[PDB]
Amino acid sequence: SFASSCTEEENNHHMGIDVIIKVTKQDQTPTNDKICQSVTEVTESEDDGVSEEVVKGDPTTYYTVVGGGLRMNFGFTKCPQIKSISESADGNTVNARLSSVSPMYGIESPAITHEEALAMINDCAVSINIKCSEEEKDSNIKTHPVLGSNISHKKVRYEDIIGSTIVDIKCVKDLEFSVRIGDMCKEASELEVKDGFKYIDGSVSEGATDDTSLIDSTKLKACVGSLV
């Protein structure tokens, strides 16, 4: 049930996901504000060569965002599709935002039942892997503005969404993360959830909290996707 706009209908939700992330690199790291160097998509459930099993696990789409002196890898398993990936940098910090796109922008997306949405909320899991990059090529920024999920990072019901968070401490000092799942047309109280953590000074704090100002989104730049 795809639609490119927001209509009034029960048990018919345009569910989306919006990931925001702010990384503070180590001082002793080489300068690199060259964001959106590359963005690649790939979906594999550990299903390929050398890894055969009787029971194959859930497939997982990985997004690798190279820029700002970092290689950011995000793994989504059973989550609303990601259609927009933006980034930005300044100083030793690099911000990135990965999300679905709301029918409000005129993009079409699936509308799922209230029940199907609750299960998705339960299964959807996001993995985080952040490595250093020496990549020096030019930013490959899009010509058009960043489209959004229409979901805000306000404090709402907590949901164990975020999984493994692995980072190369050489270039990564601090790291703040926020994940939001909800209706992209109109907030549905029971289907609005969020997960997040604040890795500061080597310490991790978890839980839902207001992150509407984690990053200044107006600074974000749309990254162009590529392959191979």
Number of domains in the chain: 1
Domain span at 18: 1-228
Query: 47 near 217, Cβ under 8 Å?
Result: no
Which residue from 85, 82, 147, 79 is spatially nearest to 112, judged by alpha carbons? 79
CATH assignment at residue 51: 2.60.240.10
Query: 71 near 130, Cβ under 8 Å?
Result: yes
Residues 6+ away with beta carbon under 8 Å from 23:
68, 70, 72, 93, 94, 95, 96, 130, 172, 174, 175
Round to whole Å and give the CA distance between 113 and 146: 28
Query: Resolution (in Å) of the shown entry?
Result: 2.6
Which residue from 130, 202, 120 is spatially nearest to 161, judged by alpha carbons? 120
The tokens of 23 are what?
């990384």
Please say whether the dihedral angle defined by the alpha carbons of residues 161, 120, 85 and 178, taken in this order, is positive or negative: negative
Please say whether the dihedral angle defined by the alpha carbons of residues 154, 155, 156 and 160, taken in this order, is positive or negative: positive
Round to whole Å and give the CA distance between 74 and 60: 10
Which residue from 91, 85, 98 is spatially nearest to 37, judged by alpha carbons? 85
Residues 6+ away with beta carbon under 8 Å from 63:
39, 40, 41, 73, 74, 76, 82, 85, 98
The tokens of 88 are what?
């930005």
DSSP H helical ranges for the chain:
114-123
Q: Both ends of the chain: CA-CA distance in Å? A: 32
Burial 109-146 (b: 16+ CB within 10 A, else e): bbbbeeeebeebbeebbbbbbbbbbeeeeebbebeeeb
